[PDB]
């Protein structure tokens, strides 16, 4: 048989697929133990199938599903049955395994108890447990004094972690007497603590976890302890009422008037957090406290009506207005003159390789809520925690060249002060008012306040007019001003440092002009032995991002404060971020809803957090590719030792092996070179190693997204390139070509001709067609379209010429020459500046 095994010998190590072509006294010493019959597939088979999912090869998964009446065979006859987005029903199908999984967990504990009462020491593996929960192999177990046995179960539980949330294993815990036929437990409305239930669940299922668990993460030791305890809390928060989460409120007295304020917060991940700077009776309200109380969602909800919205599956809180709101989107404006000129110049002939794809799409009054109901793809996810710890160390090794820390209110740089401040401030003015009316002392005091308390904020949902080749309204999430000010003071130093560095893995801030594209491509090519190019996109970035990876991103970003913030200060900062941009109240057309998680795009650190997320997923794919290969098959001694030490540092070494972290970082930099911007990535990798399996391919990335990001990756959004002279197929919506400039050869980025043509043809405001003082618009479009003159296809190369003749038309109507000369635009891609 060719089955999944979890192995650690002196020679080989890993979770992979292998061929399978004293114990009496041990068995005599040891209801969770088999006699009898043994389910063809073990728990290792299921774990490997769900963790290494590949379409067109999931025969074992199909057999496991149709064996246990999770679905029928005809369920697999329909296409995209395995897709999370196109076929949500698969989730329900997966849940049909849940209870069985849960049963296995309980039996494991029994087994371990037996060992602790017989003085037996041994390492638990998933492949010794049948799908019914029966342990049936005691090979290496030795004897010790009875009553002092010890089981090692870190690999078992760590590998099993994702499947617990994938199959919804703890559903039966939400019923009376933990019985699926029994009714649901009727928790009190006022209960919010749940600490003792968390401890009871931990002792029921994870009794033999060696590490210490903190139900409230405010008691943790560092950021790694925060990650570990937050993972456990993510698993345990799925069995508690959804009304028990969010801000905890209280009644205070200001000048004897009773106000309702927020004094704490109950997180799903971080447990219960209480504000320290609380005064039950207050005298007068200055600017700072008035701001904090007005941004508070507590009173807004407390003074609103009960709301029941059946259009959405998001938890609803209240309706501020008495009538629901409807925001539509209008069609674009048509530039008749440009259309006439293009038609006269011989364009738009039927069959031309250049066709108008990008338009402006109108929407009806139910567009904002229709786009808001995309967080339904955000599912609670439990992560392999040993893998997450090693990967977070490797991922921070990518950020060890930047400068960061805390700045003051006189060191803060804000680009645009005419932007909006969010609810409830949007009612009284722009961000200029709130930056101008606060002195630097007030802002410093507000920062000092956020370092010991939690201020919950409300975001707004806005519809953005845009151009696309897809029929979809787009919503952006605007954040309140207070969150932005303290995030700026907390993060701007590091963000500016990242944006002011050249030749690095993250290329945010690097211009594409004046040879920038050539420099970036040459930096990413590095000196990889057998280079191939790979690229990918994330299907739904902000909607379908697990909350654990967002917390990891925030912790990696905040690690720069080693000398300026104590650990309580850093934890309260992280709690503020989680309560402000992760799971907060969302105002969507006059009503308040609860955000499941993911990402708010109007955040101050969105692109950099996305870059951390990209590096984490890539490193995870590399680890899962290296660890799942037959060690005997590998022919290089260095790579085999690297794999063995990677397994040991993952599941056998609680402390951090810094030297091996450096070694793995060097291996990745040599053989897997990345250029990354937000969720966009281009990789130059060693072909021979990827073919042998020593580095990740695109299928490893697809499997990682399948079991971690809750999305499916279609080949229609992934690209591979073999010839390096042709650059990346796509990167930030640009194609690449190797033109001849002077006596050198240089890479040039060019856009899609349809996009530039549509941008010229369609606008969003009527005056954009009437002012005729928009020559700069066409000049910018021509600066973008200039590289197309080097394309072999003539219809492509003719778009820039058409733009030049239209600019001439406009200038001759108004009336320099440079704007119709090709030298002005040729100088925009020359290295010398």
């Amino acid at each position: 048989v060719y089955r999944a095994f979890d192995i650690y010998n002196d020679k080989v190590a890993g979770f992979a697929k292998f061929l399978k072509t004293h114990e009496e006294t041990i068995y005599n010493l040891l209801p969770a133990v088999a006699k009898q019959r043994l389910t063809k597939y073990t728990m290792a088979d299921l774990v490997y199938a769900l963790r290494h999912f590949d379409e067109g090869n999931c025969d074992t998964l199909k057999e496991i599903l149709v064996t246990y009446n999770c679905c029928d065979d005809d369920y697999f006859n329909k296409k995209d049955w395995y897709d999370f987005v196109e076929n949500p029903d698969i989730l329900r199908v997966y849940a049909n395994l849940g209870e069985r999984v849960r049963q296995a967990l309980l039996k494991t504990v029994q087994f371990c108890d037996a060992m602790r009462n017989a003085g037996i020491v041994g390492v638990l593996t998933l492949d010794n447990q049948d799908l019914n929960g029966n342990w049936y192999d005691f090979g290496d177990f030795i004897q010790t004094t009875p009553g002092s046995g010890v089981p090692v179960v870190d690999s078992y539980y760590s590998l099993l972690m994702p499947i617990l949330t994938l199959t919804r294993a703890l559903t039966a815990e939400s019923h009376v007497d933990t019985d699926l036929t029994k009714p649901y437990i009727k928790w009190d409305l006022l209960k919010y603590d749940f600490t003792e239930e968390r401890l009871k669940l931990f002792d029921r299922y994870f009794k033999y976890w060696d590490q210490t668990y903190h139900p409230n993460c405010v008691n943790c030791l560092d950021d790694r302890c925060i990650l570990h305890c937050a993972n456990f809390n993510v698993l345990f928060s799925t069995v508690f009422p959804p009304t028990s989460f969010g801000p905890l409120v209280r009644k205070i007295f200001v000048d004897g008037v009773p106000f309702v304020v927020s004094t704490g917060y109950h997180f799903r991940e971080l447990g219960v957090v209480h504000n320290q700077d609380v005064n039950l009776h207050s005298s007068r309200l200055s600017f700072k406290e008035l701001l904090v109380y007005a941004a508070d969602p507590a009173m807004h909800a407390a003074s609103g009506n009960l709301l029941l919205d059946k259009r959405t599956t998001c938890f609803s809180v209240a309706a501020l207005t008495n009538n629901v709101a409807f925001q539509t989107v209008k069609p674009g404006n048509f530039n008749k003159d440009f259309y006439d000129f293009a038609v006269s110049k011989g364009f738009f002939k039927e069959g031309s390789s250049v066709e108008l794809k990008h338009f402006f799409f109108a929407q009806d009054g139910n567009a904002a809520i229709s786009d808001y109901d995309y967080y339904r793809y955000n599912l609670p996810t439990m992560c392999d925690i040993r893998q997450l710890l090693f990967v977070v160390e490797v991922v921070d090794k990518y950020f060890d060249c930047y400068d960061g820390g805390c700045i003051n209110a006189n060191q803060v740089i804000v680009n645009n002060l005419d932007k909006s401040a969010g609810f409830p401030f949007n009612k009284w003015g722009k961000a200029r008012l709130y930056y101008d009316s606060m002195s630097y002392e007030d802002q410093d005091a507000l920062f000092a306040y956020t370092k010991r308390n939690v201020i919950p904020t409300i975001t707004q949902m806005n519809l953005k007019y845009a151009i696309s080749a897809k029929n979809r309204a787009r919503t952006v999430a605007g954040v309140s001003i207070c969150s932005t000010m303290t995030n700026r003071q907390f993060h701007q130093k590091l963000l500016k440092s990242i944006a002011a560095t050249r030749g690095a893995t993250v290329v945010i801030g690097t211009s594409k002009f004046y040879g920038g594209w050539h420099n970036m491509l040459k930096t990413v090519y590095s000196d990889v032995e057998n280079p191939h190019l790979m690229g990918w996109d994330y299907p739904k970035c902000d909607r379908a991002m697990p909350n654990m990876l967002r917390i990891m991103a925030s912790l990696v970003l905040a690690r720069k404060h080693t000398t300026c913030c104590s650990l309580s200060h850093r934890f309260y900062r992280l709690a503020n971020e989680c309560a402000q941009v992760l799971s907060e109240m969302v105002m969507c057309g006059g009503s308040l809803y609860v955000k499941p998680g993911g990402t708010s795009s109007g955040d101050a650190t969105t692109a950099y957090a996305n870059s951390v997320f990209n590096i984490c997923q890539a490193v995870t794919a590399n680890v899962n590719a290296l660890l799942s290969t037959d060690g005997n098959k590998i022919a290089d001694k260095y790579v085999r030792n690297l794999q063995h030490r990677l397994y040991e540092c993952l599941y056998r070494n609680r402390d951090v092996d810094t030297d091996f972290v450096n070694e793995f970082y060097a291996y990745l930099r040599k053989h897997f070179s990345m250029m990354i911007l937000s969720d966009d990535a281009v990789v130059c990798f060693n072909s021979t190693y990827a073919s042998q399996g020593l580095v990740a391919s695109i299928k490893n990335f697809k499997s990682v997204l399948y079991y971690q990001n809750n999305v499916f990756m279609s080949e229609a959004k992934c690209w591979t390139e073999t010839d390096l002279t042709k650059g990346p197929h796509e990167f930030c919506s640009q194609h690449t070509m190797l033109v001849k400039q002077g006596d050198d050869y240089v890479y040039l980025p060019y856009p899609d001709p349809s996009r530039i043509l549509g941008a010229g043809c369609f606008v969003d405001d009527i005056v954009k067609t009437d002012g005729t003082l928009m020559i700069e618009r066409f000049v910018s479009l021509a600066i973008d379209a200039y590289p197309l003159t080097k394309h072999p296809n003539q219809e492509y190369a003719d778009v820039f010429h058409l733009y030049l003749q239209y600019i001439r038309k406009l200038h001759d109507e108004l009336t320099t020459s440079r704007y119709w000369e090709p030298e002005f635009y040729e100088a925009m891609y020359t290295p010398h500046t």
Binding site: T328, F359, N471, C761
Partner: protein, 60 residues
């Protein structure tokens, strides 16, 4: 011909919006679906028929 149909659909939808049709929910929703299907369509026959329907909506 296709591009002329799409551009004329854009112009006609803009005119209808100028005619305060956006304040009738069913009319505007039907117009939005018709316009989007025109924009994503490929054959000019049904696109012409949809243009005719939108023009009849405008004249009504």
């Amino acid at each position: 011909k296709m591009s002329d149909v799409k551009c004329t659909s854009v112009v006609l939808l803009s005119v209808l919006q100028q005619l305060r049709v956006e304040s009738s929910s069913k009319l505007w929703a039907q117009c939005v679906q018709l316009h989007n299907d025109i924009l994503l369509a490929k054959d000019t026959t049904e696109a012409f028929e949809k243009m005719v329907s939108l023009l009849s909506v405008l004249l009504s």
